[PDB]
Amino acid sequence: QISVRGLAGVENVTELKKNFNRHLHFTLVKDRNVATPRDYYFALAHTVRDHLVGRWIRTQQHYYEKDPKRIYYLSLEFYMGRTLQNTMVNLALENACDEATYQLGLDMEELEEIEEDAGLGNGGLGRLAACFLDSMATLGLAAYGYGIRYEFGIFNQKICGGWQMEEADDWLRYGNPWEKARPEFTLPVHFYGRVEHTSQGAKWVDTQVVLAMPYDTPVPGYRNNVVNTMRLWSAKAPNDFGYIQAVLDRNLAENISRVLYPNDNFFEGKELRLKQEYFVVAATLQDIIRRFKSSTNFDAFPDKVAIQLNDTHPSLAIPELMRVLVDLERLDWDKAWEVTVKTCAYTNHTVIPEALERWPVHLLETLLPRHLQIIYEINQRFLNRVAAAFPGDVDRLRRMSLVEEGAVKRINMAHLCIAGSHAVNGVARIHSEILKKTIFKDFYELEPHKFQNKTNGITPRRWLVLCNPGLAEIIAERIGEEYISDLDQLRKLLSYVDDEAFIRDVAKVKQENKLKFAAYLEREYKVHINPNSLFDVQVKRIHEYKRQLLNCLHVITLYNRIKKEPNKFVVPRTVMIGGKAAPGYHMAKMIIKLITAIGDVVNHDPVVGDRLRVIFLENYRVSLAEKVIPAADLSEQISTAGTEASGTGNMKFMLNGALTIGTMDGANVEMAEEAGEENFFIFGMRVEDVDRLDQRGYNAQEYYDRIPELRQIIEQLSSGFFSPKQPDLFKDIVNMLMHHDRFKVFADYEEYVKCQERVSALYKNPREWTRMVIRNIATSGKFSSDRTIAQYAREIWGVEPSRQRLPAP
């Protein structure tokens, strides 16, 4: 029972125990004789949920009364993770429930492990949406998250024979106690059809109809009694439509919300994905307009509504809003456009070419004929403005067009978003600058005022208090609990950098987390890691730009050095790498095989002993991140400079006591700036260096010829040293590294290895390592999503955040 977990008052504990038994009986229809751990988990979940409803109802009633400006965050992904503990934390019910369940003879931690992750996201983009919802509630904003209720989220990853196997994430199998179906608010969504031009306006007719049924999930703010809503739409066929066959084919319409596309930073132009994108936008906008008409001059629309587009996925919101205002409300084009631009804002999350959405015209033409017409009109009017500002610059006109010519005509959704939004932002200072100097340079020159920066952040509730109570406690002991909702206060810890007691406590918490994780590794998965070794961790989606391959080269280097001088001392390390590969990404799947293949050799070499271990963490997800991050010593953030827009895992590691080894990419730059470069392990090419190399031409052979250790590794891979039975198993990997590596792994190899040596040197000095850690934790305040959201609120949405408690429950 620790401080930050709240009070366990003898009135609340008694009440919780009583309600727990009531739900077990009436809700689950069970008794203590046949109840299983899962039944107990649900009884607790319903009990905690009850405390949420009263606050949920009055929060919504409050917004109705005060009628503030509403913020609508549109996203195709919300990576929520588990909800039980987070709810207890935000309601200050953790110790009380811990005590209550204890008295009932149950271990609450065991029950929490039963909850399924709500994996409605792929990684960074989806988790950001989740942290944002938490911060918006904590800052008292009338915010609504709108998305899709996929019945199958990100697939569960299994490793067989060292290869990734995918299996359906049937997360709703045992039910979801957090959501509340609202079938009464079902809305129709139209597809296909054709456009008819009548006396007064165009009409979209002969369409196929799919119903959108909403499910609401509560989003509690941190101890302020505010509970916002996340509304997720589910596809339903109308009862309108051989009898048997007709009923069975209903599943054709309902497939829209069936599964999440498992791609991270990769565009797949499939019809089903386009349907999902329009589905969420169409249902959401009707809901927004309906709520507004209760709040008909749409001139005040922008004063009461703000729509934030999470990348281009919900970009159809722009032409859909125009369609409704022009075709249905009958506003003149110019007025409708003014309203649209003023309510929409766009956030770009990547500059990688293969990740940008460019939809084939023939697809939109067939699926959304009216929207295509509106997009052409928008393009026509936009290009007229470009032509007026840059007379005779024809090359500029074709570069800025929303319509892309070539093999097949495509619509550049990013161009559409910029043209129809009053603000466009990047997610890290360096990323936002790259947008203005390269990808969106032409647009920045036309409308400089639209471009902004909003550096990403993470919520300190889930990423500190929830996953690392031990650290939150020792910090609270010295500076109070105020920092949990005002992370900048962590700076006060700077005056404890020479405090012998604090140094000891910080190191003790880390050691306990490592023992806790090392245990979990054996209990689940039966591994064999040594808690005394340096925990070197790289967890994130598998992708070539992330460079898990560079990490692999270092691991093999360490192994070869040990085999060369067996009785020479080296700082023991446990290298952990985890992450999922998109099912259709061949190279990513081969990288996973390589990692397990290296472990097969290294982990069973008698000469290596327990000085080096290579472990691939299976099924990396939010719940696993909450376990491994607090236990890490070294955070690997090694993407090629200019490719990771921001990164967020990097922030989680910094807040939890791990030092960082990384490139000057994304938010790493601002992190190093806040902590001081001397307290960061920076290495490799800077963005400018990468450009110079491309000017000259990247030739990997050069590095291979001049670096003996590197040559040895490539020869081991090519000869079958890591794949005896299949000598050429890794031929594709070697071929790519040698002839077509877009991310120049070899170019940063030497500096990476040398930087890693400096990390080992510091680890040998426990006291100085811990002092540097304190320097990092103390300056991580800027990376709280509360800061990020406060900036979006003031600089983009035009609303003031608030910390005032809502009038109790």
Add this chain to the structure above:
Amino acid sequence: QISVRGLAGVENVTELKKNFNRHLHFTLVKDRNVATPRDYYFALAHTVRDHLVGRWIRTQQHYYEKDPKRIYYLSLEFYMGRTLQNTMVNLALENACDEATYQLGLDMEELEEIEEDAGLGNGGLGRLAACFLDSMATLGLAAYGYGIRYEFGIFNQKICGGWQMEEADDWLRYGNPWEKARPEFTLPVHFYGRVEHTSQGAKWVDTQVVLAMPYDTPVPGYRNNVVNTMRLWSAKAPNDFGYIQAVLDRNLAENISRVLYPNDNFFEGKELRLKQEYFVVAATLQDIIRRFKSSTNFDAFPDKVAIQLNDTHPSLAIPELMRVLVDLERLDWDKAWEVTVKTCAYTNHTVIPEALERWPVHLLETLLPRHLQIIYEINQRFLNRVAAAFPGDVDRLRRMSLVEEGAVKRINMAHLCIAGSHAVNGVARIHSEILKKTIFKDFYELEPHKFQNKTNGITPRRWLVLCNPGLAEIIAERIGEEYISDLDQLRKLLSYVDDEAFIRDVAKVKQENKLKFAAYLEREYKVHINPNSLFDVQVKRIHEYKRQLLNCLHVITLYNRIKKEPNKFVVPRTVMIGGKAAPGYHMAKMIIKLITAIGDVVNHDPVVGDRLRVIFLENYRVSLAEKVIPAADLSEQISTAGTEASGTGNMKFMLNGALTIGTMDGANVEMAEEAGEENFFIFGMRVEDVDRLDQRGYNAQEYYDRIPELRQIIEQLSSGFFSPKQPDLFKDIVNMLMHHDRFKVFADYEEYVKCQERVSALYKNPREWTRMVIRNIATSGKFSSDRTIAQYAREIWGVEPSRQRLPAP
């Protein structure tokens, strides 16, 4: 507030109101400001459900302790209807909830109309299963109903342009508060594959797996605190099985429990239907064996288990039980067969050839290879016994074989059921006799001891107390409430046949029900019936053997007679016909069109006035039956003698104050016997007369030539009198009646019309009509399903029914 509805004590009402508000708040997450009638319905449903759980848990605990013989009723259909009122009735909570909701400013009757019917059945067979579950709980039997949870039940019928239109019955859209998902008890079901013969036994391998997830619904007995279980299986794909496509194809496995085949007395040999049949049998038997091993000598299996097969739909239970005992438990064939025969019993529900299941061998061969082998072995051993009992009778061998030769080999499932069951029963005395003299004559000669009769019945709770409180009340006033669970006591009403007060009350209740229904007809559907007319009703599924066409001929006759002598007095009538037609049954759909077509002419003829009205009751279902039956004066039960196995609607009408006009078919024979033929309107050919006609040869032309009035009707139909714009619209109907009428409508026409004249004559004498009604109600006791179930229990299952209250809640 009437007597039979229970007490409304000031302690219970206060408690109900408090729990009602709690559910509205915590469960529905609403407040009195945004709540709609549907929200109030759910708040009440959850409140009533709560009172059911405590009794549900202890009932199951009781069975576990005493370990009585268990009864398993297997059926592919359970036509439950609505559950709220039935639950209140059985728990004696109706007046209390009426008062509680009244104090909350709500009308409970309005809320009850919001509940969706659980239409998991087609008609008679499915409703019988439902009445049986009610009676088994009321008689204290450890019974379990096992079936399939179709996500789409019997389709909702819409009438457009006088034609039937079908629309999906999405009954689970707003959720089902009565069921409790039990995902923890999920079981695997195998399909396809092949058979491998090993050293010790055969093995069924390389199968496709589909999971069966159970949902439990409580079944409360009448005021005895017993709550049994109805377990319905739902199909789930294993998470085992392009990534996207693979996930979308999961719906291929889950289609098994998607929709109920909408056929009544018609066999459709489709693969999907076969999968549904094995699915329910496979999951159920594993559940049964699992529960048994807790209760390994299977010799005691028949002493602890009874499996009742509702027709041949679950017939695969026989070979599946053999498969498990022989292949899995490793019992010798002879021992396994002894156990199987002793635990299984089969109930036949029809003699109509097109309704009997005869599955093509090639289907079983591909879908269930091991079962086909077992069926061949059973057939081989069975025929060996036949050959030994009737040496040299080769014709007998081919007639009795389970394998039917011909175009395509088929398995006669009825033969399989008789061979593998220790008891076979018909559902009405005349039907059971027909089985022994015709269809199953050979089997009866071989094993006479197996054949029995169990005349159908209906539950007096739903079919009297629930739907006709007014009548239940006036009856209770004179003889007490004991008859509700001992219907034979209604005989005491015979001593009131000359009681002027009772006569007046019986007639008053009927008039009130008629006004109540006449109102509903306008409020919903905007009709124009006259409450003073005789309510002539025929409601049941549309089928040629039911002869809705004969009724049509009478209606047209009445119309023509009025047009012939306009100013002659005739007893006013409101003829109501309702029922659904199977989607693929052309003739049935044409009959519906004919009925609406007749109404279009008759209802708008100025000369007819309000002396005759023809109304087609749309979407006939259980909830509608509860409204129209209590309001009927005349019950039409006119199937051709020997075609309606029993009928159950006939019993509902008799118990509710309507007189019956019908043929000596099914249970009509026993009803007339109980009430006295003088108190019934019997007409037409008897079974023997139908046979004589077939011997001679049925020639409809003869009747057409000798009956002028009949000739006129056929000429009106043929000339387009009832279809001006489409003169030959009813050509198919006329052609069938004249050249290929298997049910000889013309043969009973004259006697039918004359009998109808006798009905009108009696109606003109209110006092004598009511006295005959009292004679019917008073002798309807034999038709209580409590009597039927008591007989199944004692003569087939070997268990004693009980009326003892269970040790409170």
